[PDB]
Amino acid sequence: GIVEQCCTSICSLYQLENYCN
Amino acid sequence: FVNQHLCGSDLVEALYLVCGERGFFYTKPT
User: Impact of altering residue 22 to Q (chain B)?
Assistant: First the structure.
């Protein structure tokens, strides 16, 4: 999930955008 | 944007910040 890439690793906006519904 | 370790609260808010109305994978208000 978004948590692994962002919390376990550093994410990117685009990666954050992917999860916007 | 930024290069930080976001987790739930910080991340979710990061999404509500990024996604905004589109909502996002976690739990919207209601």
Answer: In MODY10; reduces binding affinity to INSR; reduces biological activity; reduces folding properties
